Structure 1
Amino acid sequence: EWQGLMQFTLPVRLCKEIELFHFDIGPFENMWPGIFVYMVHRSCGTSCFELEKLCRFIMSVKKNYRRVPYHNWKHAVTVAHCMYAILQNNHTLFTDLERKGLLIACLCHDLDHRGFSNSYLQKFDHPLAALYSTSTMEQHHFSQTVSILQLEGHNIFSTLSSSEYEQVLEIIRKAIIATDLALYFGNRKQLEEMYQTGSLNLNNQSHRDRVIGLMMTACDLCSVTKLWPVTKLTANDIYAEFWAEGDEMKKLGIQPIPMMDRDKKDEVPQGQLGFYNAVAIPCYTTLTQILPPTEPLLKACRDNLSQWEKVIRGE
């Protein structure tokens, strides 16, 4: 099976559509592993990784996402695809090493997620929180990536020099860390200012890491940039995960926040509104200012915001 992935060929029709931001992987489950291979090949080249190792890596990454409602294998590939479209539209802004790292990082950014937030683990003294005090899950995700890399025949970065091996791990590490939404708000705030004053410079490494940060957020949340019926369905998976967590708290005696409370569904429409206004819109707005070809992301997001506004009005 991990061999059948090597003889995979992407259908011609899909070769055209995969380039667009709005593309939806959802109806093509059996092709997701192959879709990642294709995307890595178009962005980085066909002789970048050894195909054997690359295919073994990908299959092992799929195996280590759980059967949870939202933070699953589908999510990993969804996030990788959006990165791909960002990279493709701003190709020469990034180095070979960065594109390698960011795609792999997107594929790995939620590895071994259990369906629980950083709040939960920390509040209920889960061992993961004892090990990782800030950005709990995200640190575990990066730890999971290294583990897979160190498996027999799984080290896709074996052709690299020591120097480039370290550089790419660090790129991946910051990238995964950056998907902690707790860190997004500060990041986006800084970038907005640097853009306003005209002080943002891509050759400044810390500015560069900030940009990559924002890119990781945009990709993590891109399911709000898909066509309305796709986003609506994803919303169900997201909320199915939140409610499952809130129920765990109710069993433990403690009342969950509204977002995680299956008894507060009425509040959901207004919760989506709040999320779009406070998080998602300002995310893609800042991104479009820095990387103008990412405009379609902001555009789609605005469409979905507009939709939720109709729901609140009574449709």
Structure 2
Amino acid sequence: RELQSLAAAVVPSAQTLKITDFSFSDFELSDLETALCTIRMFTDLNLVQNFQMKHEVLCRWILSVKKNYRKNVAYHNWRHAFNTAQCMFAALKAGKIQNKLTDLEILALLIAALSHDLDHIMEHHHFDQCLMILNSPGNQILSGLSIEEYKTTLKIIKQAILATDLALYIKRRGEFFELIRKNQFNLEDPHQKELFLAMLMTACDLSAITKPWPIQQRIAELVATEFFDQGDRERKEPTDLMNREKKNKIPSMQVGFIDAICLQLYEALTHVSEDCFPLLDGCRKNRQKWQALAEQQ
């Protein structure tokens, strides 16, 4: 049984699991290993002790989230959610963002990262499934929160999940970039705090684009596989982007995606914390590789 095995396992250290690395890859990990990494994330962010999470309940919640991801989705599945969460962890620790945030905000971000694609690119994200699982018998990892803490946390979770809509990122990013440019960025400002949390969610969600080349190349295959599947479904129920016949367009699309969407974000995030530079560096390196491919075409 998955639950018995998970609950009984020793949770290795964050160092052993490499989850502090921006360059982290999940390719060689089993599902069990991704669950243990996830436990280590909650544990090393001081969320387990601080909020009186029962070990068995945390284990069951992780398994419930994992099993509620559809298996026939090539990219937006448990592994992407898990990677989003790992990137959050790395940003908080290696990126030194943890000291900028409260415990409830960290709790909410980690849960949102893990849960944000449950109701699965300008796709809409929903938090209904996330909440249902959190309220499920035996899965109530927030039961240890006071009423006031609980209300605060749910609000942040909802906003964080919604933030992963790229349409909302595009709508709100100009204000973020300008606050930064005009040296007006101030996390003590509740509006700006909320804005920053949304941008951090996007940064983590898009983080495959920053990985070492062999890793980005493979994730890009999954993304293309999902796009083409959706094209096929739209036919039975298609642009070039979602057309398996226009695959030689992928390098050029990836350069476009980096230039239009990703680069400014990791530039802005680096301005907020220099220790997040490796995300920016990785994204720059991947553009150069995709461009070289777009020209050999």
The one-letter code of the counterpart of 2:67 is K
1:69 matched to which residue of 2? 74
Q: In the aligned structure 2, how far is the partner of 1:9 from the partner of 1:189?
A: 45
Q: In the aligned structure 1, how far is the partner of 2:103 from the partner of 2:78?
A: 25
State whether residues 109 and 176 of structure 1, in contact with CA within 8 Å, keep that contact through their aligned partners in structure 2: yes
Counterparts in 2 of 1:52-201, with a 5 A limit?
52-67=56-71, 68-88=73-93, 89-113=96-120, 118=123, 135=124, 138-139=125-126, 142-201=127-186
State whether residues 44 and 99 of structure 1, in contact with CA within 8 Å, keep that contact through their aligned partners in structure 2: no
Aligned-pair distance for 1:189? 1.1
Aligned-pair distance for 1:275? 0.3
Aligned-pair distance for 1:312? 1.7
State whether residues 60 and 148 of structure 1, in contact with CA within 8 Å, keep that contact through their aligned partners in structure 2: yes
Aligned-pair distance for 1:112? 3.9
The one-letter code of the counterpart of 2:85 is A
Name the SS of the counterpart of 1:260 in structure 2.
Answer: coil
Runs of 4+ residues over 4 Å off in structure 1: 10-14
Q: In the aligned structure 2, how far is the partner of 1:313 from the partner of 1:213?
A: 35
Instruction: Identify the range of structure 1 (243-252 vs 184-193) with the bigger mean alpha-carbon deviation.
Output: 243-252
State whether residues 47 and 103 of structure 2, in contact with CA within 8 Å, keep that contact through their aligned partners in structure 1: no
Compared CA separation, residues 190 and 83, structure 1 to 2 (3 A): same
The one-letter code of the counterpart of 1:78 is N
The one-letter code of the counterpart of 2:34 is W
2:224 matched to which residue of 1? 239
Q: In the aligned structure 2, how far is the partner of 1:20 from the partner of 1:301?
A: 15
Aligned-pair distance for 1:162? 1.0
State whether residues 66 and 112 of structure 1, in contact with CA within 8 Å, keep that contact through their aligned partners in structure 2: no
Q: In the aligned structure 1, how far is the partner of 2:7 from the partner of 2:79?
A: 20
- TM-score, normalized by length of structure 1? 0.88
Aligned-pair distance for 1:251? 2.8
Q: In the aligned structure 1, how far is the partner of 2:209 from the partner of 2:295?
A: 20
Compared CA separation, residues 12 and 53, structure 1 to 2 (3 A): closer
State whether residues 14 and 37 of structure 2, in contact with CA within 8 Å, keep that contact through their aligned partners in structure 1: no
2:202 matched to which residue of 1? 217
Compared CA separation, residues 248 and 10, structure 1 to 2 (3 A): same
1:131 matched to which residue of 2? none
The one-letter code of the counterpart of 2:63 is M
- Matched pairs, number: 290
Q: In the aligned structure 1, how far is the partner of 2:112 from the partner of 2:14?
A: 27
2:55 to 27, 36, 51: 51
The one-letter code of the counterpart of 2:87 is C
The one-letter code of the counterpart of 2:250 is V
State whether residues 69 and 78 of structure 2, in contact with CA within 8 Å, keep that contact through their aligned partners in structure 1: yes
Aligned CA-pair RMSD: 1.7
Structure 1 stretches of 5 or more lacking a match?
Answer: 119-134
Q: In the aligned structure 1, how far is the partner of 2:17 from the partner of 2:80?
A: 22
Instruction: Identify the range of structure 1 (145-154 vs 243-252) with the bigger mean alpha-carbon deviation.
Output: 243-252
Q: In the aligned structure 2, how far is the partner of 1:59 from the partner of 1:186?
A: 34
State whether residues 81 and 115 of structure 2, in contact with CA within 8 Å, keep that contact through their aligned partners in structure 1: yes
Residue by residue, what CA displacement relative to the aligned partner does 1:269-301 show, whole Å, maximum 9, x if unpaired? 111110011011111111111122111100111
Residue by residue, what CA displacement relative to the aligned partner does 1:66-110 show, whole Å, maximum 9, x if unpaired? 111111111111000000011112221111111111111100010
State whether residues 200 and 207 of structure 1, in contact with CA within 8 Å, keep that contact through their aligned partners in structure 2: yes
Aligned-pair distance for 1:3? 2.6
Aligned-pair distance for 1:241? 0.6
The one-letter code of the counterpart of 2:92 is L
The one-letter code of the counterpart of 1:291 is S
Compared CA separation, residues 203 and 117, structure 1 to 2 (3 A): closer
Aligned-pair distance for 1:250? 2.5
2:33 to 25, 31, 34: 31
State whether residues 3 and 55 of structure 1, in contact with CA within 8 Å, keep that contact through their aligned partners in structure 2: no
Name the SS of the counterpart of 2:5 in structure 1.
Answer: coil
Residue by residue, what CA displacement relative to the aligned partner does 1:13-39 show, whole Å, maximum 9, x if unpaired? 952622111111221123001100001
Q: In the aligned structure 2, how far is the partner of 1:9 from the partner of 1:19?
A: 19
- TM-score, normalized by length of structure 2? 0.93
Give me the identity figure in percent.
Answer: 38
Q: In the aligned structure 1, how far is the partner of 2:189 from the partner of 2:14?
A: 40
1:18 matched to which residue of 2? 19
